[PDB]
Each structure stands twice: as C-alpha cells, then as structure tokens.
Amino acid sequence: GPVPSRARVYTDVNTHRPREYWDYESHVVEWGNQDDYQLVRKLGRGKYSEVFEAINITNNEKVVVKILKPVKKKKIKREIKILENLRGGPNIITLADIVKDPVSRTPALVFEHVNNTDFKQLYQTLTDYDIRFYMYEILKALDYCHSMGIMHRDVKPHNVMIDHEHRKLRLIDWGLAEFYHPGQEYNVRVASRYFKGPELLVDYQMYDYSLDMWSLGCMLASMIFRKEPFFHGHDNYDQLVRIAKVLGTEDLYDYIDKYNIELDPRFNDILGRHSRKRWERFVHSENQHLVSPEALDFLDKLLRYDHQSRLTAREAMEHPYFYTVVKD
Ligand SMILES: [O]C1=C(N([O])=O)[C]=C(/[C]=C2\SC3=C([C]=C(S(=O)(=O)[C]C4=C(Cl)[C]=[C][C]=C4Cl)[C]=[C]3)[N]C2=O)[C]=[C]1
C-alpha cells in the first residue's frame, strides 16, 4: 500500500492543544441578534453558501453575510471553529458574528467587509512590486493558519480579497479548511481544478499544509506569466497531464514511486513522456517585466510534485524574491 507522510513543520500542533480546540463536532455556537443585520444585495452563490453585502445597524457599517446551505452538516461547525481559532491572525478574514437566518433556518456568518477588485481586472494591473507585496501578505495568512494546525485547502484568486486602494488583503472562504493531524487521511476532492496539488490528482490522501503551497505557486505562475490559469486542464485527469507537460513525467514517476502510489490506469493512454521544461520558456515581451531570476527560483521551489520538498510558508517568506518588499 502507499507509504505514509507527515508535515515537515507544525506536525504536532493539534496534539498539544486542548481537545476542544480541534474537536469541532462538540463546539457550541453562541448566537448573536439576526436583527442587527440587514441584507443589501447578493454578491455570490456557490455550492455551499450565498454571500450578501449587508449593513450592521448597530454601527451602520457594511458587513458580509454568508448564509450556509445545509450540505455536509459537519462543515458548518468545522468552518465556525476554524474562524474562531484563527480570528485576529494576520490577513485572516474576521468573523464578527453568527446569527440564525430566519428564512434558511441555517447559520449566517457575519464577516468584516473587504472592498475587492475582480481578480480578472486586478491581476492585469499588478506591477512586479505589487505581486511580491501581495504574495508576502498571503504568506503571512498561510504561515499563521498552518502554525495553528489548519490547512486552507482552497487557495485560489477568488478566495483572496484585495482592497488595492488601501493595500489590504484577506484570505476568505474557510469552508474547506481542516485540522491537520499526522497520519490522518483526507478527502482529495478539495481545491478548485486549476489549483489542485499533484497529491490530490494522484489520490494520495495523507497530505498536509504543503497542499496550500502548490495552490499558491499556481497563483504566482498565473500572475508573473500573465496566464490565467497557468495549468489549464479540461478535467482532473488532463490537469495532471498539463502539469507533467511542464514538470516532466520522470519526476512524476519518481514522486508516485516514493510514496508507493499507483497512477489510475486511465493515464496509460494520455500521460505520454515529457521533459521538465525551463521556466524561461513562459517568458515573453508582455510578461518579462514581472519575471526575474528570483521570481523563477521562488516559483520553482513551490511547484514541486513531492509535497515534502515544497517551501513551507515561513521558508517562502525568507526567499530573496521578497527582499525588495518594504517590511511593515
Ligand atoms: O467565507 C467568506 C466569503 N465567502 O465565502 O465567499 C466571503 C467573505 C467576504 C467578501 S466576499 C465579496 C466582497 C466584495 C465583492 S465585490 O467588491 O463586489 C467584487 C466583485 C463585484 Cl462588485 C462584482 C463581481 C465580482 C466581485 Cl469579486 C465580492 C465578494 N468582499 C468581501 O469582503 C468573507 C468570508
């Protein structure tokens, strides 16, 4: 069977916290007053929630209200407990309240509101400096949640709110986030297609925080190369082929062989044989101002098949790529 794996950092954070910290099933929700919040307009609907702009009438301030759908019930307390655990962390969205929506009869989560620009608009605007600045800000959030024994598992542009005017960033949508327990086997059906790590795509369940670092690397590549998304698979199978067309098939086989994983036989006809490509291949006159030797080295160290070989968040923050970013 598959060889086991453990995170190289924050391995035992949850085992040394009190049980109530991670045992979310036993958590008891304390409700606020639903009449404090008036819905103003629908912002979005996903598989698991509807999100609204609202006004808190106790201060007349804009808030965000996320009305949870009754999908997987366990997700509800999991998300709530994770948000409370992380509240106050750097660039973590602040859960301000929890109310019972009278129409859905489900929890509505009340968040601080962030003024955002659609990433499709904004990423076309970012300078080299802006990219490094915001990547560093995301790393603060990820090192924080990893240090607190939590993996996000849905890092993607849509889950990073940026108020560009005030240079403010928040990591949102913790509905897929999970507590890391060494040796635990997790659902591989997480993350959005273009940001799924190789571990998910080869059905290796004993993954960790390093999943978020693959996802971040996918974001970085799309930004510095101006290619949205970078790995553009038409399904979860073709997603791995697209990655292997860049990182090569020999290192993919080395990866699955290390963990004694067997690829789905489905890949036999479609994977082919691919050399590892040099990152310089994706540089052209329209993105070269976003690329530097430092950017390419940093990206190279995030996008590794072996989840154990990727930079950790903290190591990433030490990288030369960030030397030019003014520290606050
Ligand atoms: O778990 C969450 C979630 N979530 O689940 O989506 C959202 C949030 C907060 C959000 S969502 C949210 C906005 C702002 C906008 S926006 O300013 O309206 C940006 C736009 C607009 Cl005008 C139109 C189309 C797309 C977007 Cl992104 C959209 C969505 N800002 C927020 O602070 C917190 C926690």
Numbering used by the authors: 3 to 330
Give verbatim lines from the article.
CK2, while ubiquitously expressed, appears to be especially critical for growth and survival of cancer cells, with its activation being associated with aggressive tumor behavior and higher levels correlating with poorer prognoses across multiple tumor types. The structure of CK2α1 has the familiar bilobal architecture of a protein kinase, composed of N-terminal lobe followed by a larger C-terminal lobe. Previous work has shown that CK2 is able to use both ATP and GTP as phosphoryl donors with similar efficiencies.
The structure was solved by molecular replacement and refined to 1.80 Å resolution. 108600 binds in the cleft between the two domains, where ATP would normally be accommodated and adopts a conformation where the NO2 group and the aromatic ring are coplanar. Moreover, the NO2 group of the drug is near the position that is occupied by the Pα group of AMP-PNP or GMP-PNP and establishes a hydrogen bond with the side chain of Lys68. Significantly, the drug mimics not only the shape and electrostatics of AMP-PNP/GMP-PNP, but also their hydration patterns in the CK2α1 active site pocket. Intriguingly, in the presence of 108600, the β4–β5 loop adopts the “closed” conformation that is obstructive to holoenzyme formation. 108600 may thus inhibit CK2 as a both a competitive inhibitor of ATP/GTP and as an allosteric inhibitor that weakens the interaction between C2Kα and C2Kβ in vivo.
